[PDB]
Design a protein around this ligand. Structure first.
Ligand SMILES: *Cc1c(COP(=O)(O)O)cnc(C)c1O
Ligand SMILES: *Cc1c(COP(=O)(O)O)cnc(C)c1O
Lengths: 401, 401
């Protein structure tokens, strides 16, 4: 034996550690700001009503559990493309796209990474924003690509280093791969404004880079599915043929069901089919075919007018609660007599917020107020409720005064 | 742009090719023996009663859709290890195993392949039986391992080439990897008998090879979960610390839900925690966390005495039907006056049967009898029903007489 004696204990996960440490807390006051999923005003997981409705519909039909095609549920992939691209989008209407179901957003990103490793002969380099979601690194590295970075977040203003971004991108070698977060940047919450986006599109076009969009928060960011996909649609319209990963984890609250899709924009329908054949060859030896549950739910919702309609109301409802918490934290910090500038809290979008707090401060927060978050000053706004926003503002004020 | 112009259309799937021809056919006597899933006596997909019950139970509980841990549902992984190893297994009781949820058997196989590529310093060679399930090749190849083979099937007798298998295995360099089908060999249906298994274990032990078991048909093969896992259990008892992939796709009819597991037998519980850490690190960047539906269903069945009892009756029913079909086919052949030896049909186990028919005979069966199968003479026993076993016997006689 002794096959594994040399296998060492891997590094402990920080996110994991704050939740765990949060749990062993006795403060009734305590708060978990490291939670990566949406929570209602009561701090509870939220299953959408449109989701429960779709499940009752599925149940009623007494559906089989037979394998889906390698590429996934056709009603799902089509609807997914439609949601992303837009109903009257030329890319959509001509059928010059290829969409395959992936295991949520992460599985979709990996499939894409693997596809690029295999067929993107022009380069091995992937440029991630500084910083980006931690998983981005291993996804691409494991796939066999090299990681590079472009300036993005400005720690001085807790906003976008637009100038730094433009300078870096301008210098990226032609035909390199650039990863862009479609909206609700993770982990900062800092997104380019529509006008900066047009400028970014132009440089990307000029450098003839392959733009890879990570779209995990469509609709969940601003409450508007069209506005959330604006940037993506802009690049395509500018004639940039992107690659994209979509997640239904957050926008439909499908977390554990794992529904997502990977899309490639091709020159034509003919090319899309060639590309499609190769994606199938790639997926087979990965997991054979995708999990059916989440795809069935998502497909029902997107394809049934009445459910799609209720869905839009509910996503807006989630986006609104987050926006409300941001607004309330700022007002409450002001009311406390805080002299610092906290406008970044309201300028930021989505679930994550880069507070600008320093590590020793985060520490004071955990130690004396029972407020759990990562040492990078990142807080999950999902963890803030109307009932504790006051408490958090006070604590923050105390530690920063 | 023209990023994908050099992407060639991938080769067509012959199996799919067989199903499409089948579908076109207007002869009401047509048979599809190219089907890779269980079919009832009426030729329909079958969702187990215990599955319907578990589902209803889940709905009733209004469970959330929160992310499962990376390694999967703990209740599912424990129950999965228990099923494979046996309740009173030393490996199990001592907790010297590590089980992680995978995307059905395929995903689990791949996770394992990736784990070997990363940590199995001793060799890059994986020896597969001749022949093996088609997907085995690219699974190991995509993972970065080298493929080798050992003689397994004997076309002379449509049975095991024991002499050849033993000779090949005896020449495998120490510390190489050998893939073994736990039961219901895919695609021949030829499995070693107990005595043969004892000899094989002795050699694997002696040459100190890492045994990788693919267990996709536990309970489905003979209708007895204990008997089906006999060989895997025997290896472990002999002091061979194996690696194993389990699938619930067939035994539970979970197909599309993708419920499976990957297990590593370790020296001790300590070593298992280390290996588990490394498995989590590998999985995150693949798909983050596993699909919940299938696991929930499978856990409920295994962990609920009433449901479990019911499942055993149902899996037995499935296996029984298949054995009955093999039985009926053989007697009907004699009945038609087939002088030939068709004992292999009954000696073979599981879903697949290598008939020994030649390509030209297969063509005649398709062309003249509207009986669809692959040219290797492989038949899916699931496609045979009480209503058509007679016809098949008939057609076989005609083409071999
Ligand atoms: C959540 C998220 C994804 C997708 O997550 P899944 O649960 O795998 O769908 C992808 N990228 C980012 C940046 C995310 O925050
Ligand atoms: C079915 C099967 C598997 C697992 O298939 P999944 O649908 O991915 O669970 C693995 N190996 C063999 C030989 C099989 O026949």
């Amino acid at each position: 034996s002794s096959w594994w004696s040399h296998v060492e204990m891997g590094p402990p996960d920080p996110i994991l550690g704050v939740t765990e440490a949060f749990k062993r807390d006795t403060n009734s006051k305590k708060m978990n700001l490291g939670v990566g999923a949406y929570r209602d005003d009561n701090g509870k997981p939220y299953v959408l009503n449109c989701v429960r409705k779709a499940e009752a519909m599925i149940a009623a039909k007494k559906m089989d559990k037979e394998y889906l095609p390698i590429a996934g549920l056709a009603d799902f992939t089509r609807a997914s493309a439609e949601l992303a691209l837009g109903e009257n989008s030329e890319a959509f209407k001509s059928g010059r796209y290829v969409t395959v179901q992936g295991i949520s957003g992460t599985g979709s990103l990996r499939v894409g990474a693997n596809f690029l490793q295999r067929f993107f002969k022009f380069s091995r380099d992937v440029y991630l924003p500084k910083p980006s979601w931690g998983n981005h690194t291993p996804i691409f590295r494991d796939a066999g690509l090299q990681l590079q970075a472009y300036r993005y977040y400005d720690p001085k203003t807790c906003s976008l280093d637009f100038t730094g971004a433009m300078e870096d991108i301008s210098k990226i070698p032609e035909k390199s791969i650039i990863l862009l977060h479609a909206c609700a940047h993770n982990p900062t919450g800092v997104d380019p404004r529509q006008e900066q986006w047009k400028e970014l599109a132009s440089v990307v076009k000029k450098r003839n880079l392959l733009a890879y969009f990570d779209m995990a928060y469509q609709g969940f960011a601003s409450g508007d599915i069209n506005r959330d996909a604006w940037a993506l649609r802009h690049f395509i319209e500018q004639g940039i043929d992107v690659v994209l990963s979509q997640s239904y984890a957050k926008n439909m609250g499908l977390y554990g069901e794992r529904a997502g899709a990977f899309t490639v924009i091709c020159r034509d329908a003919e090319e899309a089919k060639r590309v499609e054949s190769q994606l199938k060859i790639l997926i087979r030896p990965m997991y054979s075919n995708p999990p059916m549950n989440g795809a069935r739910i998502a497909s029902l919702i997107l394809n049934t007018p009445e459910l799609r309609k209720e869905w839009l109301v509910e996503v807006k409802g989630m986006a609104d609660r987050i926006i409300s918490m941001r607004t309330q934290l700022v007002s409450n910090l002001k009311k406390e007599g805080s002299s610092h500038n906290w406008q970044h809290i309201t300028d930021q979008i989505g679930m994550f917020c880069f507070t600008g707090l320093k590590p020793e401060q985060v520490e004071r927060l955990t130690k004396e107020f029972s407020i759990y978050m990562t040492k990078d000053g990142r807080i999950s706004v999902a963890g803030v409720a109307s009932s504790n926003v006051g408490y958090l503002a006070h604590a923050i004020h105390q530690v920063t005064k």
